Amino acid sequence: PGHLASAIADEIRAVLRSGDPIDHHRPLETLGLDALMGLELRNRLEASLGITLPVALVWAYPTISDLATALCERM
Amino acid sequence: TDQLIASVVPELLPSAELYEDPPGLEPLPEEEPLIAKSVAKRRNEFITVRYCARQALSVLGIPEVPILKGDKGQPLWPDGIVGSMTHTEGFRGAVVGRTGEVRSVGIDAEPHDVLPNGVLKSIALPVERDELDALPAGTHWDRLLFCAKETTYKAWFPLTARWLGFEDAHITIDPDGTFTSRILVDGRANDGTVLSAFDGRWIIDKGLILTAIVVPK
Numbered sequence: 001p002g003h004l005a006s007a008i009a010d011e012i013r014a015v016l017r018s019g020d021p022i023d024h025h026r027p028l029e030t031l032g033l034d035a036l037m038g039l040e041l042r043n044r045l046e047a048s049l050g051i052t053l054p055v056a057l058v059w060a061y062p063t064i065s066d067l068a069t070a071l072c073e074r075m
Numbered sequence: 076t077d078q079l080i081a082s083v084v085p086e087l088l089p090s091a092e093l094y095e096d097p098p099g100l101e102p103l104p105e106e107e108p109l110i111a112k113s114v115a116k117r118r119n120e121f122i123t124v125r126y127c128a129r130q131a132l133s134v135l136g137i138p139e140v141p142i143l144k145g146d147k148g149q150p151l152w153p154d155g156i157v158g159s160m161t162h163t164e165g166f167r168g169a170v171v172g173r174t175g176e177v178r179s180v181g182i183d184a185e186p187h188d189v190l191p192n193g194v195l196k197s198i199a200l201p202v203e204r205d206e207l208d209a210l211p212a213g214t215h216w217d218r219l220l221f222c223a224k225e226t227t228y229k230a231w232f233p234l235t236a237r238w239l240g241f242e243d244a245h246i247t248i249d250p251d252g253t254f255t256s257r258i259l260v261d262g263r264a265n266d267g268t269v270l271s272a273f274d275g276r277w278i279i280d281k282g283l284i285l286t287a288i289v290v291p292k
């Protein structure tokens with residue numbers, strides 16, 4: 001869940017249009033990730049990892065660290 | 076009126092909206108921890124929408140009070156009050172009411188643009204996609220649908236404390252300025268009643284969509 005977390009961090013940067021590194025335990029809404037951006041992040045992770053994810057993905061695991069453990073578990 | 080929220084909710088529900096972040100606003104002390112680690116954009120929308128909410132609350136006689144957030148991020152209103160808040164680029168808005176007159180309310184504001192690539196398929200039922208294609212040209216029906224689905228969740232959650240997915244409601248949009256949401260999952264509320272359908276209203280003005288749902292008492 002380490003290699004994958006930084007890739008999730010990269011997709012978040014693309015959705016937010018940002019270049020700074022992200023705190024893995026920082027809830028994504030404090031970065032300004034709204035509901036539309038979470039949809040885009042969910043769809044980008046499906047296409048990037050080739051796997052199925054629920055669209056309530058980001059709201060289940062609201063941090064990079066939580067997302068990476070979820071995504072590694074079933075992937 | 077001239078305000079977007081006021082045009083889609085009855086007058087018994089006071090509302091307030093600002094299209095910019097005025098200089099010098101600040102959160103209440105109890106609200107500061109919720110944005111202490113948040114980016115400036117997020118801080119600003121949080122602070123401004125709560126100025127709006129406290130303005131609407133004062134009309135109902137409620138004095139300055141923090142509006143904290145619950146377990147799924149829902150705003151925590153004073154007892155006897157229901158309400159909804161929304162922020163997007165160029166809009167901060169809030170509406171509130173007393174439980175003696177309305178059971179629940181949700182609002183959502185979106186820019187009147189097409190949805191980003193891929194989003195419509197994520198949020199629309201196959202039947203909804205055909206219905207949007209039959210609607211008259213000149214309106215971004217895809218963004219209206221996404222807006223109305225969120226308003227449906229915002230009205231649904233204070234009543235059920237349950238998740239509602241995008242595939243869990245069928246929204247029908249009328250050029251009227253009205254829409255309907257048909258709940259496709261079990262709709263047991265927390266008062267015993269069953270929630271099957273919501274009545275919604277929508278307006279497009281100043282480059283924004285605004286949708287609203289009032290659940291009558």
Ligand SMILES: CC(C)(COP(=O)(O)OP(=O)(O)OC[C@H]1O[C@@H](n2cnc3c(N)ncnc32)[C@H](O)[C@@H]1OP(=O)(O)O)[C@@H](O)C(=O)NCCC(=O)NCCS
Nearest residue numbers: 034035148149160161162224225228229232239240241244
């Ligand atoms: C609630 C939600 C729609 C709002 O996301 P958004 O992009 O920030 O949209 P808005 O800016 O218009 O609304 C933000 C406000 O909604 C309120 N909010 C957050 N969670 C809420 C919840 N369960 N219930 C009611 N209101 C909520 C908050 O007041 C929040 O503002 P705040 O964080 O500053 O206090 C989204 O986060 C969500 O959780 N969606 C669930 C899935 C869904 O929409 N299904 C559709 C059913 S068909």
Ligand SMILES: C[As](C)(=O)[O-]
Nearest residue numbers: 005006009021022
């Ligand atoms: C520190 As990083 C590359 O995961 O945002």
Ligand SMILES: [Mn+2]
Nearest residue numbers: 034161162163
């Ligand atoms: Mn917002």
Ligand SMILES: [Mn+2]
Nearest residue numbers: 183184185225
């Ligand atoms: Mn919205």
Ligand SMILES: [Mn+2]
Nearest residue numbers: 055056240241
């Ligand atoms: Mn969903």
